[PDB]
């Protein structure tokens, strides 16, 4: 049993996105299908169900409007197109197949979700830091102003593991902020080099920050 | 009918027993479902029917209650078993999920190190300043980052991140930021980060002018 979908969406506000949720190692329309909705660290939210037979839904009332189920027996897919997107809808999105008693409504088998995430920000670089102390002394990144995420950090092009903590991106504005610091010994540095190196996918940019005094 | 796990964290060490509690708003009738997900993962199936084991899980855990109140235990809590855990009910629609209940490991306390960062020159040259203080390796995760320029405290501006439960050494870290234009920053002089953490009676006091 495999439920496949797409990797992650990047969305305008007020446009709308459709989710696929491909299913195969079973046969399709004798199981219904249902989604779920899962905030950044928060609980997970019932969306609605569909029959893939008779392509009949029953939603969850708060999704009305907002979600629409459909499938494609013919190709053994079910969708789920979300409308007027605003900050709220930015979730990770997951379609569950029912057991063959749909009845017993749980969820042994789940797709591995789709991030939609809602912007109106344009693909950014991001500017890339260096912070310096001002017998282990600590070092650090700033990577600041990007867009979307994720970057790449690394140190010393990852001969430093160790003593580093490269934290979780936060959104400043409508952009995004991470840092890294690396920790070392006193006696490697300055007398040895240490360089942070961000990659940022998006905008196929690479930096090496070295770290001085 | 809405279905409230109450703990939102629980610190546990390996072997434990820990008990989770799922209360209904109505009796469900033993249709309920328990899960366990992992940070980045899908939710995973552990019991259905209040008490059923899925194939796979392993038998330290087990599910029991009635009517309105359920419970998910684990006899010997294993690493394995950090996580966090869902309940969701399904008498009637709409399907509800609990909030969820996040076990965490518990260890030794520990002091967080903090490091201060004035902003450096390549930023100066863009507009604007960063001050950073990173605040790493601490335990327990309750902490508290306070930043005052000239001595007044400075709320606007900051931003925190943290990062989960280390699986290495179960600790926690923050990084916090202050940021401001060049000219604010040059405005004033001296930059401080305050952290208060149960290790200390005294705040930890890093600062720069």
């Known amino acids: 049993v495999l439920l496949q979908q797409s990797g992650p969406e990047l969305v305008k506000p007020g446009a709308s996105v459709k989710i696929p949720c491909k299913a195969s190692?079973?046969?399709?329309?004798?199981?219904?299908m249902d989604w779920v909705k899962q905030s950044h660290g928060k609980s997970l939210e019932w969306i609605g169900d569909?029959?893939?037979?008779?392509?009949?839904?029953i939603y969850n009332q708060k999704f009305k409007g907002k979600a629409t189920l459909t499938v494609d027996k013919s190709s053994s897919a079910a969708y789920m197109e979300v409308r007027s997107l605003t900050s709220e809808d930015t979730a990770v999105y997951y379609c569950?197949?029912?057991?063959?008693?749909?009845?017993?409504?749980?969820?042994?088998?789940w797709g591995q979700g789709t991030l939609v995430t809602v912007s109106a920000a344009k693909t950014t670089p991001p500017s890339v830091y260096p912070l310096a102390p001002g017998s282990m002394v600590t070092l650090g990144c700033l990577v600041k102003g990007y867009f979307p995420e994720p970057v790449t950090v690394t140190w010393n092009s990852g001969s430093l593991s160790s003593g580093v903590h490269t934290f979780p991106a936060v959104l400043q504005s409508d952009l995004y902020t991470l840092s890294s610091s690396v920790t070392v010994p006193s006696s490697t540095w300055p007398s040895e080099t240490v360089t942070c190196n961000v990659a940022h996918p998006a905008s196929s940019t690479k930096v090496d920050k070295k770290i001085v005094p | 009918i809405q279905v409230t796990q109450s703990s939102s964290s629980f610190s546990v060490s390996l072997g434990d027993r820990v008990t989770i509690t799922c209360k209904a708003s109505?009796?469900?009738?033993?249709?309920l479902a328990w899960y366990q997900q992992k940070p980045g993962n899908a939710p995973r199936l552990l019991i259905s029917?209040?008490?059923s084991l899925e194939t796979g899980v392993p038998d330290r855990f087990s599910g029991s209650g009635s009517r309105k109140d359920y419970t998910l235990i684990i006899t010997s809590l294993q690493t394995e078993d950090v996580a966090t855990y869902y309940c969701?009910?399904?008498?009637?629609?709409?399907?509800?999920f609990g909030a969820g209940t996040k076990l965490e490991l518990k260890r030794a306390d520990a002091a967080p190190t903090v490091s201060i960062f004035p902003p450096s020159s390549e930023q100066l040259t863009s507009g604007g300043a960063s001050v950073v203080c990173f605040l790493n390796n601490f335990y327990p995760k309750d902490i508290n980052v306070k930043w005052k320029i000239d001595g007044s405290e400075r709320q606007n501006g900051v931003l925190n991140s943290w990062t989960d439960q280390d699986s290495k050494d179960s600790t926690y870290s923050m990084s916090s930021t202050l940021t401001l234009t060049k000219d604010e920053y040059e405005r004033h002089n001296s930059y401080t980060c305050e952290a208060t953490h149960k290790t200390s009676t005294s705040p930890i006091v890093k600062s720069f002018n």
């Open positions: 569950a197949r029912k057991p063959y008693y749909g009845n017993f409504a749980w969820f042994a088998y």
């Open positions: 190692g079973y046969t399709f329309t004798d199981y219904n």
């Open positions: 569909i029959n893939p037979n008779n392509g009949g839904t």
């Open positions: 109505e009796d469900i009738y033993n249709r």
């Open positions: 029917g209040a008490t």
């Open positions: 969701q009910q399904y008498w009637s629609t709409p399907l509800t």
